[PDB]
């Protein structure tokens, strides 16, 4: 069985700073959530996510990862992160799971 | 069941002006295309979109969204959607499907 | 049966030039990985890639193309890839299979 | 998706004389069913029947087959059948349907 | 997922009296057996029953029922039932489950 | 995936003596068949016999098995069996095969 839904993370002036955890990586930000699965499993699925949303300024290099931290059988939890002085306006991911 | 093909959008001159569903976004353009699946299903299937291929002008914001417009058994509307002066030179769409 | 990954490109200093398949693009270059199912299948899986990390220089276009070459029952080739001007910093796909 | 479902097909005096398809033999009696799916198929599923309950006169050969006739997306023909001087007090058949 | 076995409820000297749920037969007696899934399920499964042995006394009538009473997601209740003046010598239930 | 079929041992004049795995058990024959499927699979696939065909004689007990010897990806063997007096003068089984 297979779900799937869209997570909108919007503009960074709302994301959260998170430490880094790669030297080379300063200003680290992201918009972190924990998505609850419209029916458990009874054991994590397979979840597959993708960028289906950018706006990122020009003048900046873009700089941006859909993470995936974990995955458990009712939901997981997945981020829009970037880093340095990449600005993004709006940045939204979808995602399926399958059982 | 599953299936997957993909969408090339190619260079937004020869994209569609469509009337704005945001008051922030203006010059929204896309490509929308009906794909007809390889296979009827009996009911909607679900459907993701991956952004697999950008050719994007530097000068602009990068303004992307991969839409999923609806679903049927027999396909999907999906759509490359670009808004404001961003110029999109290539865009393709990979997709799965999976019953 | 549904399998998922990730594959890191990296910085495109590492990346192979390729002959070009399209005659107007140039400096065509890749970071080519043969995948290896961990379970292999009795006939080819579907297989879809999605772009889940970019670090892109502001300065030149963003050219990026996330490849699916081939695929058989026990995995498949994929690639990174740009052309012309563009300087990729990072580039990673994740991937699913489904049987 | 898997269904299942008992047919009981009672005491053989209910049967129907139906014309015999084999000339060795005669007598030949059924309980016919047409089954409706709780949830039809989009193309016939596979059908399994099972004799579950008999309750047959010992005086005279135990003669017996559970017949499938036909399947079809939303349903399937199915019979108890006997022949000669067998009598059945009672007989049941279980199915399961897999799409 | 699937999953099989085989019940082997032996002489009925071994089975017990239980109440009739039809007054139309007496001295009914049965083996019942709880039996325990290798994987339990979220959601009880199907199952379906199969009389796979028979060792039935000709002087009497045969009457043979394979009970299925409940299923659970981890496993299910089924006896092999007989009644009035019938001696089963040995009676086997194959069973199939199917998620 | 699912297949399924039958297996027609006809009369037990047709079978072969075999060794008896049983010592309470005497003249133990049977019909033994190599079923191949209509479609190999990579690992052995679940099976279920029913027996859906018996014709036997009432004079002495009936005694029957449906065995299931071995199941492999591309089929599987199983047998009618009968011992003592028993007479078969028709016996069909019925399998399901499901991945
Ligand atoms: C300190 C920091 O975040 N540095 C970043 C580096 O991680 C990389 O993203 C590079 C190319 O875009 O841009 C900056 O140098
Ligand atoms: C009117 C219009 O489309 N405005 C756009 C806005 O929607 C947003 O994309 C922004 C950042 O890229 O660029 C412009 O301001
Ligand atoms: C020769 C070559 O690679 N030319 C490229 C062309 O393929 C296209 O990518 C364009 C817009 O970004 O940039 C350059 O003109
Ligand atoms: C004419 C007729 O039905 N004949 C039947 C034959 O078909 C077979 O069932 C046999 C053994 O039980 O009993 C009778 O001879
Ligand atoms: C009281 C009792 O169990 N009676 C049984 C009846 O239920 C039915 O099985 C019949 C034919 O075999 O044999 C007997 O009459
Ligand atoms: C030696 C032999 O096969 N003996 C059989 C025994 O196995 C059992 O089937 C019994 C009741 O039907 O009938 C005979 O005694
Ligand atoms: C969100 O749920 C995930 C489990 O997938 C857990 O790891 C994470 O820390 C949770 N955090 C919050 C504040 O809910
Ligand atoms: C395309 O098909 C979709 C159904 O998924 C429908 O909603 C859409 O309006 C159709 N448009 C055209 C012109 O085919
Ligand atoms: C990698 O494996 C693929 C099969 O999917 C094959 O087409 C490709 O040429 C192989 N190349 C290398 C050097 O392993
Ligand atoms: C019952 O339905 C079946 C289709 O599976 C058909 O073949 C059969 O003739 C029908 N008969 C009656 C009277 O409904
Ligand atoms: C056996 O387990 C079933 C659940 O499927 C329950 O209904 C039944 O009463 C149990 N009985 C015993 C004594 O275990
Ligand atoms: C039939 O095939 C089975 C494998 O399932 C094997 O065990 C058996 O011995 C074979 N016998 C014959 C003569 O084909
Ligand atoms: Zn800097
Ligand atoms: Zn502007
Ligand atoms: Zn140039
Ligand atoms: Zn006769
Ligand atoms: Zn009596
Ligand atoms: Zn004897």
């Given at each position: 069985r297979?779900?799937?839904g869209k997570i909108d993370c919007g503009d960074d002036a709302?994301?959260?700073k998170v430490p880094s955890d790669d030297p080379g990586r300063?200003?680290?930000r992201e918009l972190?959530?924990?998505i609850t699965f419209a029916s458990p499993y009874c054991r994590?699925?397979?979840?597959?996510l993708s960028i289906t949303q950018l706006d990122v300024?020009?003048?900046?290099?873009?700089r941006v990862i859909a993470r995936l931290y974990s995955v458990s059988p009712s939901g997981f939890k997945a981020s829009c992160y970037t880093w340095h002085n990449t600005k993004v306006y709006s940045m939204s991911i979808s995602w399926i799971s399958i059982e």
């Open positions: 297979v779900q799937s709302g994301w959260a300063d200003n680290t972190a959530k924990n994590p699925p397979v979840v597959l300024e020009q003048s900046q290099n873009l």
